[PDB]
């Protein structure tokens, strides 16, 4: 049933997730999230293949060469939330 929940807000999604937790539906949560993932959006997202692609993109951007990058290396909250290989590589770059 849950996958059909008419979520819109952030809270709606968090509710869904909370129910996936409460019932232990990691495959469901993984799917819901997959639906959410589908530049800023990509940054927010940062399955294995996708992560690899994101890594490659980051590398390309670095070779070509802001807040997100600093966080990887309001702000405190972001650092707390952040607290993977692709990410580490981008941070190194």
């Amino acid at each position: 049933l849950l996958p059909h929940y008419p979520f819109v807000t952030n809270d709606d999604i968090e509710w869904m997730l909370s129910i996936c937790v409460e019932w232990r539906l990691p495959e469901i949560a993984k799917e819901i999230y997959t639906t959410l993932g589908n530049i800023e959006s990509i940054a927010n997202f940062s399955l294995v293949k996708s992560y690899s692609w994101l890594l490659f993109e980051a590398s390309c951007m670095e070779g070509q060469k802001v807040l997100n990058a600093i966080v990887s290396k309001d702000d405190v909250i972001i650092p707390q939330d952040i607290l993977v290989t692709n990410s580490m590589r981008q941070t190194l770059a």
């Epitope: 952030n10 809270d11 800023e40 807040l67 405190v76 909250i77």
Partner: antibody, heavy 114, light 104 residues
């Protein structure tokens, strides 16, 4: 979705007021609550914010040491305790949230005088 | 503390006119800039976030753009209901506001 602000009004200078902002329709626990004030005929002034996630708080220079922002995630309610109030603090006070500032309090008027 | 300077502080424009309000950051902020509309006697209402993202439900005549440290709020076709003070925002700081009136 709605922020609610109560507890302003008339207050003697040097006095004190606790403002409440009761939230609903959103995740208080991962939001940031800000207080922004507007003095008669003037622009908006951000005074304080709190992270409900980390409990981190911060303040504009103009209110530091006199104003305390706090938050109770378990009743989805945030607070601004205003001590040693001054004529300079007379203003409509708005609570607002971030997950920019998408959700705004209807505002409550604080008038400070003797 | 960061200062946000709006130009002009006041303007008059006819219905159907295109209106441009600019905001210049004291130092270099990043696209972390929002635009609001405030009617007198009421809470500000979010218009634009992240410099150029249109907040949900807001009429498409409102748009935001960035050129370096200059931020632009544009109203493509001014409506009579659009009179207000508009504010940019990046401590969090607000611009001083731009008052928009209808010319007759």
């Amino acid at each position: 979705v709605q922020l609610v602000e109560s507890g302003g009004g008339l207050v003697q200078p040097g006095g004190s007021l606790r403002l409440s902002c009761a939230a609903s329709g959103f995740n208080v626990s991962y939001s940031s609550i800000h207080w922004v004030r507007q003095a008669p005929g003037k622009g908006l002034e951000w005074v304080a914010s709190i992270y409900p996630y980390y409990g981190s708080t911060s303040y504009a220079d103009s209110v530091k040491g006199r104003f305390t922002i706090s938050a109770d995630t378990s009743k989805n309610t945030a607070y601004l305790q205003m001590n040693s109030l001054r004529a300079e603090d007379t203003a409509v006070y708005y609570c607002a949230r971030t997950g920019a500032l998408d959700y705004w309090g209807q505002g409550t008027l604080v008038t400070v005088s003797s | 503390d960061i200062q946000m300077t709006q130009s002009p502080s006041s303007l008059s424009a006819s219905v159907g006119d295109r209106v441009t309000i600019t905001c210049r950051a004291s130092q270099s902020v990043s696209s972390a800039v929002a635009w609001y509309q405030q009617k007198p006697g009421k809470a500000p209402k979010l218009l634009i976030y992240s410099a150029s993202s249109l907040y949900s439900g807001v009429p498409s005549r409102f748009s935001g753009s960035r050129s370096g440290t200059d931020f632009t709020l544009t109203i493509s076709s001014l409506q009579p209901e659009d009179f207000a003070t508009y504010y940019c925002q990046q401590p969090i700081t607000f611009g001083q506001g731009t008052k928009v009136e209808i010319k007759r």
